[PDB]
Amino acid sequence: YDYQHDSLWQGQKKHIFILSEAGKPIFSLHGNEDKLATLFGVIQALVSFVQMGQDAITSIHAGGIKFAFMQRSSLILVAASRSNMSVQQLQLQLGDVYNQILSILTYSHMTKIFERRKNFDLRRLLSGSERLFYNLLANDSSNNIFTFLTNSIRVFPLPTTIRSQITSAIQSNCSKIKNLVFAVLIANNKLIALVRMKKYSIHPADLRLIFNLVECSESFKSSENWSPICLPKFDMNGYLHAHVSYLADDCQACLLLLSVDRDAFFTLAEAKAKITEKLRKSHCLEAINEELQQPFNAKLYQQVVGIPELRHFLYKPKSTAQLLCPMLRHPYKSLTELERLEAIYCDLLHRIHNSSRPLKLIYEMKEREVVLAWATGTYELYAIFEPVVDKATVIKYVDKLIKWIEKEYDVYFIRNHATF
Amino acid sequence: QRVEITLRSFYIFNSTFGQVEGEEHKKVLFYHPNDIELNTKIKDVGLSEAIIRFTGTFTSEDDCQALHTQKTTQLFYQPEPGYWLVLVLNVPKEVVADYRGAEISDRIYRAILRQCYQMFRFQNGCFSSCGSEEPNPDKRRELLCQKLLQFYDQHLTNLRDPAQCDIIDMLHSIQYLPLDKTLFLRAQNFGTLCETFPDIKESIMLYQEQVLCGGKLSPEDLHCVHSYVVQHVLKVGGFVRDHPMKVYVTLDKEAKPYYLLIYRALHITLCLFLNADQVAPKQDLYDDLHAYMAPQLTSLARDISSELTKEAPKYLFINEQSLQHHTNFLPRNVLSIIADLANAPAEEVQVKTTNDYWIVKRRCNYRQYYVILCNSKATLLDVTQEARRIFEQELTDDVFFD
Amino acid sequence: NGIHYIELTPNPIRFDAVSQLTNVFFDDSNKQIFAVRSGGATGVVVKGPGSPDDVVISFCMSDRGGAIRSIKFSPDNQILAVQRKENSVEFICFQGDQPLLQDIITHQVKTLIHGFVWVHNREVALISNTGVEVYTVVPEKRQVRSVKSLSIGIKWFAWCCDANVALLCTSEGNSLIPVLVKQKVITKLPKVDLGNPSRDVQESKVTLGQVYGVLAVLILQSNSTTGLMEVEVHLLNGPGLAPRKCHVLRLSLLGRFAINTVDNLIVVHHQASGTSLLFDISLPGEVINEITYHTPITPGRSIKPFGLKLILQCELYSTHWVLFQPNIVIDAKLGCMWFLNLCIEPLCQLISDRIRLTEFLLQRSNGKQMLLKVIGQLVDDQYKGTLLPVLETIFSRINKIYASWVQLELQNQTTPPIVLIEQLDMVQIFQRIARRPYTESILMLYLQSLNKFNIAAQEELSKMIISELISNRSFDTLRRLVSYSMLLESKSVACFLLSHSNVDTAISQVAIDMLGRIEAHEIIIEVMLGQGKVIDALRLAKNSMGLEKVPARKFLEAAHKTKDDLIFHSVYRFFQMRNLKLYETLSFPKAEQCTEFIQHYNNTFPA
């Protein structure tokens, strides 16, 4: 397999390699890792030679492709890109892959398995879990990449009283159970309700791991499930056991009950039955199903239609990890322009958050867009406007939009998470 | 304790030589710190070649640009097929030893690395042309090594401080010289020396360290002549000097050898170019030229001096076609932001730094305009008119159409 | 054939030859040749200066009275005047071409009469020993009456026609006095200065003439230190009309002499040698005591010999040649009248110094053509690297008289120089040397010459300068010239410069800058549309025009031809918003003719 004479293989826009320090293939995104064995030897040779000088490789820049390197715990990770992303974002992606590896296998077990014996084949333990890696790295270029760039999830729109009723049902029916640490309800890749135990807080990376696990599997609708899962930020040296099930047939909402004790399947099953009966009696599944049946939101659509010069925007409060974004429309339906939109957002996000040269406000007037990026002490705003608009109108449009958001905050955002 | 950017090594190599076993040390043509042991010299070239080979799997080998590491930063350049120039830097440090390598912009140092080769070529020619007389293909490289040593033991010593680099270093700009109508025509009248003496092919003028009459030469060649005269004549009333100095410039079709002659009259420097195919000129030409040019140049340089003696926001305007700039020049972060913004249709950028600094950039008609406002907290509405006032005072005509 | 530069006119005026039955008289105020014929009852023949067919007026009445010594006519050929006795001058009426005289007018003078002149159209002034008198004549009563007079002793008089000035002697001492005689106006003028010891002077030495519009008195003198001859020149360009001595003419020969004026040049004749000499007042010379001393401009030479077809050649420098102050030659035996003219082409070879030749030729009636020819010869055929300062001074000699005329014509409140050379004349010469290595050095030198005297450049010179600078690849000079505004700002120059935008981009940059300065936005918009920058053209047209005047079909067609959907969306939304602002709807008006773009947009972006 001469990989130097394959134009299709070289033409891809993202490559990810995971190997061991001794040159043993573990993970490759495109192509079998068996036929790519010289390349891993070259990578190991480079890394070791540079390390022998008491120094560590960070990145490599070429004409039209960049490479980023990473090394923790007897592992080497390499990421190669042809896109507009900077090095730090590729490093964050590599950290995400490492977090997935630690989610499948505990850190202590891997450390012991390498310390006791080297030259170990880790594919055998990392078997039957390629879906969790392929899905995580397929969020490139109809929009979840904004979630990854801003590191924040989206919330399911609902009136506040319905949400309070759901939370009340969950709290009332799941109070006697001990060692019950989280309870999560997810519908169409969107958060609805989360109840936690005091002195414990959910970290965005673990919460996104739960979303990925729920999205990847398809047998979760078949019957009631029981599986182990490890949260790296919560505890890197153990398993939390999950009771996973859908609400009912009419409402496609997935409920996860995470506990620390192994012997809690039946008690949590009874809790689930009580919870779904209570919600069915109180007329709560109806609102969820009605919202799901619709293609897009109504009030937000009308507000965006009211401003005939706005094409897309991104909003994120600083205090919490949440996002608001509208639906894609005609000028950006195709992929060839979706890529350009993503490039603009990546450049703005890098420029605002640079550590050496922090910025506070960006206004640009280009041939095809008029872009605005604002960062204040409460919110952040990234907006795109038509190229032939005037400056004195952008300000008033932004002001009215922010005023509307400040009064519709409670329908799209969750401020304080409930506790048992 | 803080440490800024410092230079570590500069080397030139070609990997074709040294194929036979036991003679791998022939590929090193120039390594800057000569005291370094040869074994340490070989390993750097090995690592570089490994990086090119690794990059060659995906894209072409000619596209390799830079290498980033926790403690260093290495930069590559290929002027001709086979030959490579590499420069190694040290990253800033703050003391726990925190490193701040993100503060380095590669474009400035790549521009410096290009200037090095251009300055070599101006006087000696291409790497592949040295020693063209020798038929033995092994003795030809010794002459190249000798020439490289002679040039680069004096070029690198007088290099500019790496800690201070700006847009002007990136862009190769020289300041403008305002002047009036009559004196410019009087100065231009000196180009008539060709008709009296048919050997002269071109003449250029300099007032102090600024250009007064450039003539036909391209901007890059003019920059090379300016740099050489500044660094070898002024800083170190008659001809400055037997075969004269030979230089390589292109005037009509290709690059050809020429004889350069330098004449000083107070604050006016005149550079004259002669052919290099014929014999070097004799003393009669020098005597005639001196006796013909002594009074007029002195009178003109005495008049221009009298004319010049009689006559918070920052701005910088740059012309791309002629490579000349007008400015009245700030913390390091502002200058780094300006370096990032520098580079084609029109555009307009307004940026506010965290330390209350407004930067306004515009581009129109092969030109770039930068205005920096400091120590002023103003909204986005007022900055446009504050910049318009400055764009009105210094620019006689408005090209932005209000 | 030799070389000769002073000639007699090809066609003489022939009249009756001198004999023992005829005489000759000449009046120079009207250039009348008078001849008598005693064969009849004293018939007469009168000839004219410029009449191609002059019917001679034959009056045959004068039979008694004695001898004639003066014949004159009125300026309009109305009254005839004759003198037949030493103390009587008589007048004859002249109606039509025949006398009709019954009683003729007579007069009496106390002293012997010298002469009389026709001061104006109807009266005559007499000079007699007592002094000057004026008399007015009308035929309705056949009587003449005086108006004014004065009494000064007189020896002989000299007369002039243009300035009405008479030059008179005194019987008290050897002194000369001018006088002005006009319509009942007699004015005296201060005397000519010779020396505190009074010195005598004769008739053959003193002449009165016109030079450059000023009346001058010329007197021949021999130096005491050296026996050579000189001509003293007194000019009447003082306060009022008073004499100041200004010039002395040198000859360095001995013998007879005669002074004439030929095309504003002073000509001196010599007999023993056989040569004629020329002097010009205007040319410089040695200056001492506010007096300029002059030398001949060319070595002495002769007059071109003249042959006639009665070919038998005629003699020259004879004894009966008579020379008058202007260019007139009268011969006794032959009976001919000749004019003197100048040939300039031979002079363009003897005077080898080019600056002196230019100064000599800038003040002549037909010196323009020869000067242009010599400038063309210097710039085209005989170019050398050391001729440029000569050209600089030659150009400076023209631009001064150009600037003076322009400035003097500029003045207003509500006689041009003899040879004037402007830009249109010199550009035609510069055209024939285009596309040559040495053209820039001439054009820039001319531009500097214009600059020193504050004359702005015009169109075609700017065109040629631009073309040469572009061809030789001199862009810095072009940038600096357009920066100083030394080229005319007009649409023709900007369009010409833009037509050369394919060579390099700097030319395009300069053209766009010039178009911006003169505010021609239509051409800029068309240029940007041609390049492909449609949205920038739209942004500019929004400000240049209004918002209701921007066309819609053209920009939409350009966006369609761009083959990019985003630009089409941008222009379509711009015009949709304009329609919403104006007519409060998002519907294109029917009169806009945009039926195809609607369908294309619907087929590209589906709802």
Residue numbers in the entry:
A (entry chain C): 104 to 244, 250 to 528
B (entry chain B): 6 to 100, 108 to 248, 271 to 275, 292 to 361, 378 to 395, 403 to 416, 426 to 484
C (entry chain A): 5 to 314, 323 to 426, 441 to 633
Q: How does the study describe this entry?
A:
We determined the cryo-EM structure of the full-length MCBulli complex, only lacking the first 100 residues of Mon1 that were removed to increase complex stability. The final consensus map had a resolution of 3.2 Å and allowed us to build a high-confidence model of the complex. The structure of the Mon1–Ccz1 TLD dimer subcomplex of Drosophila melanogaster (Dm) strongly resembles the structure of the MC1 complex from the fungus Chaetomium thermophilum (Ct), with high structural similarity of the LD1/LD1 core domains that bind the substrate GTPase Rab7 or Ypt7, respectively (rmsd of 1.96 Å over 183 residues). Bulli adopts a leg-like structure composed of an N-terminal β-propeller “foot” and a C-terminal α-solenoid “shin”. Binding to Mon1–Ccz1 is mediated by the α-shin domain, mainly via interactions with LD2 and LD3 of Ccz1 and a few contacts with LD3 of Mon1. The β-foot reaches away from Mon1–Ccz1 and shows some flexibility, describing an approximately 5° bending motion according to variability analysis of 3D intermediate reconstructions. The extensive interface between Bulli and Mon1-Ccz1 (2,021 Å2) is dominated by polar interactions, including a conserved salt bridge between BulliD539–Ccz1R449 and hydrogen bonds between BulliD539–Ccz1N447 and BulliQ535–Ccz1N385. Interestingly, the surface of Bulli contains an extensive conserved surface patch, running alongside the α-shin that points away from Mon1–Ccz1. From these observations, we hypothesize that MCBulli attaches to the anionic membrane surface via two basic regions at opposing ends of the complex, thus orienting the complex on the organelle. Consequently, no influence of Bulli on the activities of the Mon1–Ccz1 core subcomplex is to be expected, pointing at a role of Bulli as an adaptor that expands the interaction spectrum of the complex.
Tri-longin domain (TLD) RabGEFs represent a group of protein complexes that play crucial roles in the organization of endosomes, lysosomes, and lysosome-related organelles. The sole TLD RabGEF in yeast is the dimeric Mon–Ccz1 (MC1) complex, which activates Rab7, an essential organizer of the late endosomal and lysosomal compartments in eukaryotic cells. The Mon1–Ccz1 TLD subunits in metazoans bind an additional protein named RMC1 in humans and Bulli in flies. The intact trimeric complex is required for proper Rab7 function in endosomal maturation, autophagy, and lysosomal cholesterol transport.
